Amino acid sequence: MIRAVFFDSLGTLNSVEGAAKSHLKIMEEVLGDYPLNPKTLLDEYEKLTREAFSNYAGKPYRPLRDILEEVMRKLAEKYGFKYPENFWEISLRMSQRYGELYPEVVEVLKSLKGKYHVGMITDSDTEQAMAFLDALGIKDLFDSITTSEEAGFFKPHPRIFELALKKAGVKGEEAVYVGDNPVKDCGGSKNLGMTSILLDRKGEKREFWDKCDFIVSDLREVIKIVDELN
Numbered sequence: 310m311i312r313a314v315f316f317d318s319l320g321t322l323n324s325v326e327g328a329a330k331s332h333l334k335i336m337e338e339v340l341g342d343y344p345l346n347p348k349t350l351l352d353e354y355e356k357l358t359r360e361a362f363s364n365y366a367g368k369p370y371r372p373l374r375d376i377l378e379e380v381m382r383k384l385a386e387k388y389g390f391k392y393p394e395n396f397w398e399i400s401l402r403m404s405q406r407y408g409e410l411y412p413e414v415v416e417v418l419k420s421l422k423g424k425y426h427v428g429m430i431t432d433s434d435t436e437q438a439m440a441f442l443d444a445l446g447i448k449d450l451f452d453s454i455t456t457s458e459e460a461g462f463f464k465p466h467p468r469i470f471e472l473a474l475k476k477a478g479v480k481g482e483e484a485v486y487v488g489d490n491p492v493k494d495c496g497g498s499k500n501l502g503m504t505s506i507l508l509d510r511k512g513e514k515r516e517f518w519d520k521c522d523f524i525v526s527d528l529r530e531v532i533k534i535v536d537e538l539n
């Protein structure tokens with residue numbers, strides 16, 4: 310019996326498009342009048358951050374603020390502009406003003422809460438996860454918010470999932486996890502017997518469909534699956 314439904318953050322609740330728009334305005338405010346194409350700075354920022362997150366996958370937690378400030382200090386020295394000491398604050402402000410939820414998030418979160426435990430499991434520092442849920446107005450729709458900072462390990466380490474299930478007081482077999490990253494999400498949640506639901510909004514992850522238990526393009530399909538199984 311499924312009694313809990315857990316969600317990832319980026320790509321599941323808040324749109325990658327909104328994050329890309331926010332990230333661009335972040336690099337813009339960092340550069341100001343500096344003669345560096347903010348688009349080139351962003352592409353290089355995403356390349357370095359992808360490499361960093363890959364090195365830390367499944368490993369002990371390190372503050373994301375430190376990891377990202379390290380990347381931007383390297384980019385500042387590379388291109389010659391002043392490292393903004395308030396980079397973290399700028400990222401928070403812009404993320405909150407231009408971040409947006411997918412059109413069906415609130416509807417889905419409401420239909421689930423009350424019937425099942427509704428939780429989030431995210432690779433991010435707890436401060437930023439809470440501030441972003443608040444800026445998007447959906448913090449009160451979750452019964453639990455579980456972060457790599459709390460568990461001490463990044464996904465797909467099982468501890469972050471273990472902690473989520475413990476907060477809800479359910480077994481893995483009684484829980485669903487929804488996300489768009491086949492390895493960190495389906496693989497990490499499958500270790501505990503959770504039902505994995507892959508979210509492929511644009512149908513770009515067909516090569517990983519055969520490993521996750523279910524695949525959906527819209528979160529409104531999650532409620533259907535939970536009913537089919539119960």
Ligand SMILES: *CC(=O)c1ccccc1
Pocket residue numbers: 328331332377397400401404437
């Ligand atoms: C990249 C991005 O959106 C971000 C980075 C650090 C803190 C908050 C948001």
